[PDB]
Amino acid sequence: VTVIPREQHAISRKDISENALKVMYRLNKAGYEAWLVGGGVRDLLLGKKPKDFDVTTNATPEQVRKLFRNCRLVGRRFRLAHVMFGPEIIEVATFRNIFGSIEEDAQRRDFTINSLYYSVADFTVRDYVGGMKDLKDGVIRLIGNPETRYREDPVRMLRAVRFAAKLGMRISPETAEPIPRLATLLNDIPPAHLFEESLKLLQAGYGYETYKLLCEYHLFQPLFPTITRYFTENGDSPMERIIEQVLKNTDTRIHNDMRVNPAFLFAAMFWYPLLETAQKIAQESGLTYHDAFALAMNDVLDEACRSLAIPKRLTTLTRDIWQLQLRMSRRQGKRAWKLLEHPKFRAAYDLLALRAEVERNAELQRLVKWWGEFQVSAPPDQKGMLNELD
């Protein structure tokens, strides 16, 4: 099977395809035939709506700059041109001695249920791989040779986990074996390539299950060297349980169209890691705490950062998120108000929420309940809280 006729494939309905579909006609008219793939297709066959509308035509990124010479075309780099609508953008990649048959760009892509094609001209899809059965039975497929396809681009390992996680559907016996083994290979991939395929995974609002998987494929290990070192066997650490909730929350905080702070998940895991760090250096060298901490932060970062390039933006925040953890501590006669205003505050507290619950520490939980009240107070109450301490 390498095709399915209009009505026979889960009623695609030219209907749930967008303004995006609009573009497909200035192509279907000016010459070339245009096919949409992956992001919408995979989703849409199940029926579930489309996340991004990714187009793919034979017309070269030039005939295309030459065709929509008009439209607010944007986005440099080979092929990959982004034509704009507004709250809807449409990626435009051409097939790929460099270019060729769409079937040709079939083999360059990575997964079966992730790459099925169709034009408004045909109302028919195109299965150049077992794509439709993989979708039918909920199963993950690299297109070609596992062994090759990763050594070639080990990043393909991660997407593969990434996807089995979003969908309550399982990987493939053959596609699956390689990784525990090759796993490590990632190490030579620039840290920031890693750092991006990282967020994409768990701060995708799918995290918890994604990591349930990653850990188990000793894939977690490479990105978070810094961390894995602190797991325990039993399975019950704070570090361990903490990340279980911080993701669980995020899975949820996202499933509820709410902005989540990126910097937050990171300072979120490492707390302990940096914490156990901060500890040893503290005594093992003559120096005071406020100080000791300072470097504690640098090395967990330089270390983990070395494992995956973290934006100065992110770090600078994550730094702050912590340093407050140490200010929310010193019940201050009147400095409270100050911290209260601090830009990066909500996270600081958000952490401490978690923090006091995993650690199952009373004199923290005691404190969180306090900042809890004192932050929603008016000023007549806040005025008074600060007066019971002195």
> Which of 54, 122, 299, 350 is labelled catalytic?
54
CB 93 within 8 A of CB 80: yes
Has 110 been annotated as catalytic? Answer: yes
Token code pair at residue 228: 């894995």
Catalytic residue among 43, 105, 110, 134: 110
- Note whether 239 and 230 are within 8 A (CB): yes
- What are the structure tokens assigned to 65, written together? 């700059």
Asked about 291 being catalytic, the answer comes back as: no
Catalytic residue among 52, 137, 302, 381: 52
Residue 52 is a catalytic residue: yes
Catalytic positions, please?
52, 54, 110
